[PDB]
Amino acid sequence: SADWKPGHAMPSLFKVQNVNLERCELANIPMPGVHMNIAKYMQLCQYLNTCTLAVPANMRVIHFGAGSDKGIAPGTSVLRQWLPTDAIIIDNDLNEFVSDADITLFGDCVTVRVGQQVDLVISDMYDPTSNESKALFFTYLCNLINNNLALGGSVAIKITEHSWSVELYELMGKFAWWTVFCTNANASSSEGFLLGINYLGTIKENIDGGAMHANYIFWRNSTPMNLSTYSLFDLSKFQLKLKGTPVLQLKESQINELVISLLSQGKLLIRDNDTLSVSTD
Amino acid sequence: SVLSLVNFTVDPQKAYLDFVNAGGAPLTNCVKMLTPKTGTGIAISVKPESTADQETYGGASVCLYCRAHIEHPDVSGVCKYKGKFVQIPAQCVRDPVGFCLSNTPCNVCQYWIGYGC
Numbered sequence: 206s207a208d209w210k211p212g213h214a215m216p217s218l219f220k221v222q223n224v225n226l227e228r229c230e231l232a233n234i235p236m237p238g239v240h241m242n243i244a245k246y247m248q249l250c251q252y253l254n255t256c257t258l259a260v261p262a263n264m265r266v267i268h269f270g271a272g273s274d275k276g277i278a279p280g281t282s283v284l285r286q287w288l289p290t291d292a293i294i295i296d297n298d299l300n301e302f303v304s305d306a307d308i309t310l311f312g313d314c315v316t317v318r319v320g321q322q323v324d325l326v327i328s329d330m331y332d333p334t335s336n337e338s339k340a341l342f343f344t345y346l347c348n349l350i351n352n353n354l355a356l357g358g359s360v361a362i363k364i365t366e367h368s369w370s371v372e373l374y375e376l377m378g379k380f381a382w383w384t385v386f387c388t389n390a391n392a393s394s395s396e397g398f399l400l401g402i403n404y405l406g407t408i409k410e411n412i413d414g415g416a417m418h419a420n421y422i423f424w425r426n427s428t429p430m431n432l433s434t435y436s437l438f439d440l441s442k443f444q445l446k447l448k449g450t451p452v453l454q455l456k457e458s459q460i461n462e463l464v465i466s467l468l469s470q471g472k473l474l475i476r477d478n479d480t481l482s483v484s485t486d
Numbered sequence: 487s488v489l490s491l492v493n494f495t496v497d498p499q500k501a502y503l504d505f506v507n508a509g510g511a512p513l514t515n516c517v518k519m520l521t522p523k524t525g526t527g528i529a530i531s532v533k534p535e536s537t538a539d540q541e542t543y544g545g546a547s548v549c550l551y552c553r554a555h556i557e558h559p560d561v562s563g564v565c566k567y568k569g570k571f572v573q574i575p576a577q578c579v580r581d582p583v584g585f586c587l588s589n590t591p592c593n594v595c596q597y598w599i600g601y602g603c
């Protein structure tokens with residue numbers, strides 16, 4: 206069964222452990238002219254199809270670390286295949302590339318100014334260069350979640366054994382639900398996607414970030430994962446559901462039990478309804 | 487290499503086609519999508535539309551002008567492919583860029599001429 210699933214998600218069984226941080230020791234992939242990152246992104250999208258993502262009209266999606274050394278952006282094309290046709294994709298990378306994004310911005314992600322709040326953040330950013338919490342682009346991403354993410358919005362942020370951040374783990378406590386998702390396509394890598402589903406702007410779970418990375422590695426060290434892309438054999442329902450999620454403007458004072466419940470079920474976004482301005486500074 | 491070469495001419499389309507017609511290696515790393523081969527089969531589409539006799543590519547990656555970072559030749563400044571998906575006949579997947587430079591979709595019918603209209 207597991208190899209027909211798109212990947213593995215960290216269970217609460219490992220979220221509630223208390224262990225020291227150990228080295229990641231994994232014991233363990235071919236593609237049909239198809240880049241591997243096609244399979245990796247499709248499986249990430251497949252898993253997000255089972256989460257309660259807000260899917261509005263004019264959906265606002267930003268994709269960091271979209272470029273490859275080949276000057277193309279396979280992940281962005283997968284997002285174009287997955288997302289509603291009227292979704293707006295902004296992508297970014299330090300290096301030059303060309304992509305099917307609506308807007309493409311070159312340079313450090315810190316040069317990306319999001320004027321308005323977005324609905325979905327995908328990050329595949331990774332810096333080629335004693336395993337302590339890293340800063341790097343994570344400082345930028347954490348500030349984005351605190352300021353430029355719609356209530357009800359979601360994030361999927363690539364981490365590895367050595368590329369990770371205490372602060373980002375703790376921010377997962379401000380979503381209605383969170384996990385780390387590991388694609389079967391890249392299952393022999395310590396890579397995972399930290400998922401925060403439905404941003405609430407308020408602390409729902411108190412998380413010790415450094416302890417939780419230790420729990421993530423303990424999970425990877427405890428969990429056989431076979432390389433596989435069987436989940437991509439049937440793509441008949443691959444596209445993201447056209448939920449027509451409403452976008453509402455509310456003051457903090459108005460956010461009551463009903464609103465939090467709607468945000469937590471993926472049934473509502475709270476943010477501006479303006480037109481998006483995302484530019485380099 | 488071929489990307490550098492189309493920067494040395496005022497007819498990048500002819501430059502690329504003469505280059506591949508003379509044995510040059512077609513441009514690689516076109517973004518081939520995985521898709522259910524159940525589409526309508528039109529040339530250029532908002533979502534993948536490949537039939538069982540086609541493969542679907544991300545549009546920017548099969549556009550010579552996009553890949554080589556040179557001016558798009560359209561009357562406006564808009565790629566016909568970028569942000570869309572381009573269906574290629576399965577027999578032509580060795581050089582998607584060359585196929586797109588050598589063919590045109592039906593004006594009424596939107597399928598490739600000689601493969602639809």
Ligand SMILES: Nc1ncnc2c1ncn2[C@@H]1O[C@H](CSCC[C@H](N)C(=O)O)[C@@H](O)[C@H]1O
Nearest residue numbers: 242270271272280298299313314329330331
């Ligand atoms: N600070 C930063 N700002 C923007 N991109 C960064 C970054 N730090 C690392 N990256 C990008 O992280 C990327 C990891 S590889 C990305 C592969 C791509 N997602 C695909 O679809 O194939 C590299 O291209 C790297 O340049």
Ligand SMILES: [Zn+2]
Nearest residue numbers: 549551552565
């Ligand atoms: Zn183009």
Ligand SMILES: [Zn+2]
Nearest residue numbers: 592595602603
């Ligand atoms: Zn026709």
